[PDB]
């Protein structure tokens, strides 16, 4: 509570179908209800009468403030990559008995994010850059070495490649291989899962009919979903606030 946040509804593959773009905040001990996902219950429409299961998962105990579960850190998937369920992290916690559920994610120090340099880039170096060079777009090689563009060196080759815009496409939607805050709409994710994930096609020709290569078996589930999380987070480069030890802009 007392922190800015928003939310994303997810499918069985754990990708965001719809993102809520705004900044929501909760006061301590407070709680907030909504009829739907931008249904208009908080804008132009009366609350629809709905009897929900979640209502019984909220507060059932007289000795507790809230019996509702805290946000889980990880996910577990089955062998096919479908969503199996939610998984606890190592942040678990005075403390009193004022809630029934385990206390998770209240430590600001240990709150997890996906950083391209620390997380994605090594995966790219290991499983990708071998076959991808200047001669085979996108160019994922070069490691973490910064690339100067218009007199400014910020990110690496792989980041510059993946975030490259596409002709005839709104950059607010996405680029060639990447759609910020939509993984399901990203061509990269389309190829990594080797399927058409959404009703929005990134471009006209996607899967080559000649010399095609299946990319779905190149990554483990953790790596691939790490990329998915990275894209759904807005596909940043430096996710650690303030100056850090990881490669970046320096003068």
């Amino acid at each position: 509570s007392d922190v800015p946040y928003y939310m994303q509804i997810l499918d069985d593959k754990g990708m965001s179908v719809q993102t809520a773009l705004t900044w929501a905040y909760l006061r301590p001990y407070h709680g907030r209800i909504c009829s739907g996902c931008h249904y208009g219950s908080y804008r132009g429409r009366a609350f629809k009468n709905i009897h929900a299961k979640a209502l019984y998962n909220w507060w059932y105990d007289d000795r507790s403030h809230y019996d509702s579960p805290f946000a889980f850190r990880y996910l577990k998937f089955d062998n096919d990559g479908n969503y199996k369920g939610v998984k606890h992290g190592e942040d678990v916690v005075g403390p009193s008995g004022t809630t029934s559920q385990p206390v998770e994610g209240l430590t600001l120090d240990k709150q997890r994010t996906v950083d391209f340099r620390r997380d994605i880039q090594p995966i790219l170096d290991a499983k990708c850059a071998m076959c991808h060079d200047s001669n085979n777009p996108p160019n994922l090689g070069g490691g973490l070495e910064l690339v100067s563009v218009d007199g400014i060196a910020a990110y690496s080759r792989a980041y510059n490649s993946l975030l490259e815009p596409q002709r005839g496409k709104d950059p607010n939607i996405g680029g060639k291989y990447v759609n910020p805050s939509a993984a399901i709409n990203s061509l990269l994710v389309w190829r990594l899962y080797e399927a058409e994930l959404s009703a929005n096609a990134p471009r006209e020709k996607i899967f080559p009919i000649e010399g095609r290569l299946l990319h779905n078996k190149f990554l483990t589930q953790d790596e691939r979903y790490a990329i998915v999380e990275w894209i759904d987070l807005g596909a940043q480069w430096d996710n650690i606030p303030g100056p850090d030890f990881y490669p970046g802009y320096l003068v």
Binding site: S134, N135, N136, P137, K205
Partner: protein, 352 residues
């Protein structure tokens, strides 16, 4: 001297061409109206002599050691062998009609001469030891304008500029074999003035124009009649042929002629004869565009009039009629030969 195609005399040299010694100490300028070749010291930038050759030279090539200069005499239908140190022509070998260009093999053992006569298709080979024509390599079509030899030295391309043809092609020759392996057609092209190789030999660049012949002649806007283009061809078997625009919407480069390739292949230099300027392009952005685009997308991008600004480094003011350009071995300087102004423009490149 005579103005080309006329009996009228002129005192002006009228340089049609320029090249440079592999050691970069000397510039050799072919004077079309002067019927001679001007020697220029690169360091002091002043003329060290003028060597008389046969009548109307349009081209020249230097041996790897730099002890000899092979000059193409167009109307004499010949090739002059000149001693560089002695500043004297030591021989005349005679070839097919209108050599427009000549190139020396990497080993320096052989010189290839493109015969540009309208009804003439030939590439004449010349042994440097015999100092004489050996045989002739017949191209796929008429009027080869210029040739180029790979850094490999095992392959020879010839741009075929063919009168009365909309589709104009490029021939690939196997030097050891001595005949045509493949012919690649540039569609809707005309006036191909040059062909150059990338240092890695994976690409070739060709300057030309794209006419629209099948359309009424009405306005000058949006390149309704002529657009000006540079084409990059992948030397790979089944490689892409990418026709790219040289023009802005309201600004065109008239009749691109000469080309100079950066030693490390970073930049491309294009002499623009009509607009009297040198167009410098970024080759990593161009080739980057070629590799990352399909054939369809490139074919569509050929008519994009805003595309140039992506890969265009500069357009540099020059003298009148810069028909040819050349580079120093370090690639830090680009020289452009101006016919009408009778001079040479020296350009400091982006390389530092």
């Amino acid at each position: 001297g005579y103005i080309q195609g006329t009996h009228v005399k002129t005192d002006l040299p009228g340089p049609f061409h320029i090249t440079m010694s592999p050691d970069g100490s000397t510039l050799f300028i072919s004077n079309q109206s002067g019927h001679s070749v001007t020697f220029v010291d690169a360091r002091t930038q002043k003329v060290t002599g003028e060597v008389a050759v046969r009548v109307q030279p349009e081209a020249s090539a230097v041996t790897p050691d730099g002890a000899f200069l092979y000059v193409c005499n167009a109307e004499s239908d010949s090739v002059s062998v000149v001693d560089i140190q002695r500043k004297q022509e030591i021989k005349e070998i005679k070839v097919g009609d209108w050599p427009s260009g000549i190139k020396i093999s990497p080993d320096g053992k052989t010189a290839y001469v493109a015969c540009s006569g309208c009804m003439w298709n030939a590439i004449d080979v010349i042994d440097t030891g015999r100092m004489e024509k050996v045989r002739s390599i017949y191209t796929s079509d008429y009027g080869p304008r210029m040739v180029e030899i790979s850094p490999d030295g095992k392959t020879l391309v010839a741009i075929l500029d063919t009168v009365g043809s909309i589709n104009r092609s490029v021939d690939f020759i196997d030097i050891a074999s001595g005949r045509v392996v493949e012919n690649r057609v540039i569609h809707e092209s005309s006036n191909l003035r040059d062909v150059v190789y990338t240092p890695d030999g994976k690409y070739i660049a060709v300057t030309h124009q794209t006419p629209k012949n099948w359309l009424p002649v009405c306005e000058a806007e949006n390149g309704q009649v002529f657009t000006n283009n540079v084409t990059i061809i992948e030397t790979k078997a089944g490689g892409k042929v990418a026709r790219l625009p040289l023009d802005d919407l309201n600004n065109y480069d008239g009749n691109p002629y000469g080309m100079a390739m950066d030693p490390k292949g970073k930049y491309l230099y294009i002499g623009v004869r009509g607009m009297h300027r040198v167009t410098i392009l970024d080759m990593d952005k161009v080739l980057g565009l070629v590799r990352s685009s399909t054939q369809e997308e490139l074919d569509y991008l050929r008519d994009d009039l805003g595309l140039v600004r992506d890969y265009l480094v500069a357009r540099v003011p020059t003298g009148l009629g810069p028909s040819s350009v050349c580079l120093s071995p370090d690639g830090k300087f680009c020289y452009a030969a101006n016919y009408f102004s009778n001079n040479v423009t020296v350009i400091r490149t982006a390389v530092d």
